[PDB]
């Protein structure tokens, strides 16, 4: 992800088939002639899409030009959470499945995984960053405190941001409970609040057509909501 001063990010397409699939996802959703009510509603929860972009002198080098969801914040606190019970998609080989489950074998049980966070701390005027090993170390016993860490800002627990996060996730969940045409694997929610709220869906390299509720995504959202709700009682 390259952050551009104009308030966009450039995401380089991942190698095939992932990058092409994510391109086609955005293209389908943001199709100019799209009057699909499900897909029109979905646009609210995605980064705004500005189309494919490549350097003037390098047509080979493919990027997605996306809204920088963090742009309107002064000191954004950012958390990336992968959603679902399965991080592998319906066409994964046995080895791929093993690889994906191996990465975090608690995915089925918990239904989400923290990919990272950047938390601005007022006292130090500095950022605390957690990498992918942070979230992959969290268990059922430590997930609540694991998530809570994100909201430690301003000499307090930011229950305002926690409550707002629940409210925004709830709308995304309502979307999922009213669609049966897309299933989402290894996609994320990006949480942003002001450290000095946004909750958006990102990362669509494994989005597939379906004829069922995305039950794994729904489970993940519901468990995430339940954890955040518990944090409100701290
Ligand atoms: O700091 C983090 N992430 C971060 C930071 C700054 C900006 C963004 C960001 O803003 N808008 C985005 C739109 C799409 C995507 C995106 N799409 N597929 N992968 N990333 C990322 C985006 C994300 C994580 C916690 C460690």
């Amino acid at each position: 992800i390259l952050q551009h001063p104009d308030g966009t990010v450039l995401k380089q397409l991942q190698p095939p088939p992932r990058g092409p699939r994510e391109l086609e996802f955005y293209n389908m959703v943001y199709a100019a002639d799209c009057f699909d009510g499900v897909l029109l509603e979905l646009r609210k929860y995605l980064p705004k899409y500005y189309g494919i972009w490549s350097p003037p002198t390098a047509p080979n080098d493919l990027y997605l030009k996306l809204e920088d969801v963090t742009h309107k914040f002064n000191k954004p606190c950012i958390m990336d959470v992968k959603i679902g019970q399965k991080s592998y998609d319906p066409f994964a080989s046995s080895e791929k499945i093993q690889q994906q489950v191996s990465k975090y074998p608690l995915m089925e049980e918990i239904g989400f995984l923290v990919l990272g966070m950047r938390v601005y701390h007022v006292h130090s005027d500095s950022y605390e960053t957690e990498n992918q090993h942070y979230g992959r170390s969290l268990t059922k016993e430590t997930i609540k405190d694991g998530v809570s860490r994100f909201f430690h800002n301003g000499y307090c627990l930011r229950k305002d941001a926690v409550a707002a996060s629940i409210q925004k996730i709830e709308k995304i969940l309502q979307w999922f409970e009213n669609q049966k045409q897309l299933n989402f694997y290894a996609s994320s929610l990006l949480f942003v609040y002001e450290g000095s709220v946004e909750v958006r869906m990102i990362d669509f390299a494994h989005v597939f057509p379906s004829n069922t509720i995305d039950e794994g995504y729904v489970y993940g959202l519901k468990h995430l909501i339940s954890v955040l709700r518990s944090i409100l009682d701290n």
Side-chain angles (χ1 to χ4, degrees):
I1 283 290
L2 271 293
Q3 283 181 291
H4 199 303
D6 67 357
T8 57
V9 299
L10 287 184
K11 187 191 182 172
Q12 190 178 52
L13 266 69
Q14 299 162 263
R18 288 181 297 163
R21 281 199 311 244
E22 179 168 44
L23 169 64
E24 203 72 289
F25 173 76
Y26 276 111
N27 277 346
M28 160 185 81
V29 170
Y30 282 93
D33 68 306
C34 177
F35 301 121
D36 181 350
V38 170
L39 295 185
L40 286 186
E41 171 78 21
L42 176 60
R43 290 179 184 177
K44 304 176 193 299
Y45 308 111
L46 268 45
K48 180 164 186 177
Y49 178 53
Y50 294 97
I52 191 73
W53 180 95
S54 56
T57 55
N60 52 286
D61 194 4
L62 303 183
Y63 301 78
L64 305 174
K65 190 170 180 62
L66 302 175
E67 172 187 2
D68 181 349
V69 171
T70 75
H71 187 66
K72 288 175 180 171
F73 293 81
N74 178 19
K75 297 293 182 179
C77 300
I78 310 159
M79 177 175 69
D80 186 346
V81 186
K82 184 176 284 183
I83 305 300
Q85 288 179 285
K86 310 180 195 311
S87 184
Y88 56 84
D89 69 42
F91 293 108
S93 59
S94 296
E95 297 70 53
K96 174 58 65 171
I97 293 166
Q98 194 172 258
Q99 180 205 64
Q100 283 303 298
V101 177
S102 173
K103 192 180 74 78
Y104 187 62
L106 280 175
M107 197 67 77
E108 198 76 52
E109 299 188 18
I110 298 183
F112 64 83
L113 169 64
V114 179
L115 293 188
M117 52 182 79
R118 303 176 184 179
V119 185
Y120 178 67
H121 295 302
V122 174
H123 78 296
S124 54
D125 177 44
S126 68
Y127 268 94
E128 175 201 6
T129 63
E130 301 295 346
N131 65 29
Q132 284 191 6
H133 295 80
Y134 173 77
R136 287 206 285 134
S137 65
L138 297 183
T139 66
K140 271 198 156 291
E141 199 172 314
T142 57
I143 192 60
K144 178 173 167 287
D145 285 338
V147 167
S148 298
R149 175 182 291 288
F150 176 53
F151 298 103
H152 290 176
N153 162 260
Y155 308 107
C156 70
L157 177 67
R158 291 291 304 280
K159 288 185 180 184
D160 63 309
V162 173
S165 295
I166 294 165
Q167 288 176 304
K168 282 162 185 280
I169 296 170
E170 173 57 20
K171 303 300 294 198
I172 294 172
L173 172 65
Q174 283 171 358
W175 180 79
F176 270 86
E177 296 192 53
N178 288 280
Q179 75 93 3
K180 307 169 56 53
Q181 67 196 69
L182 292 171
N183 289 358
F184 294 71
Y185 303 96
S187 76
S188 275
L189 290 182
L190 190 67
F191 292 80
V192 193
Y193 72 84
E194 182 57 72
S196 76
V197 170
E198 278 286 4
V199 178
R200 306 271 199 102
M201 292 166 69
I202 65 165
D203 193 0
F204 304 116
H206 309 264
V207 181
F208 290 83
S210 175
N211 58 5
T212 81
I213 294 292
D214 189 344
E215 311 98 350
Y217 199 104
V218 166
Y219 172 96
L221 290 187
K222 274 202 74 82
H223 190 211
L224 185 52
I225 283 173
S226 187
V227 171
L228 291 169
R229 173 64 185 78
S230 191
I231 294 169
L232 288 183
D233 294 337
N234 282 8

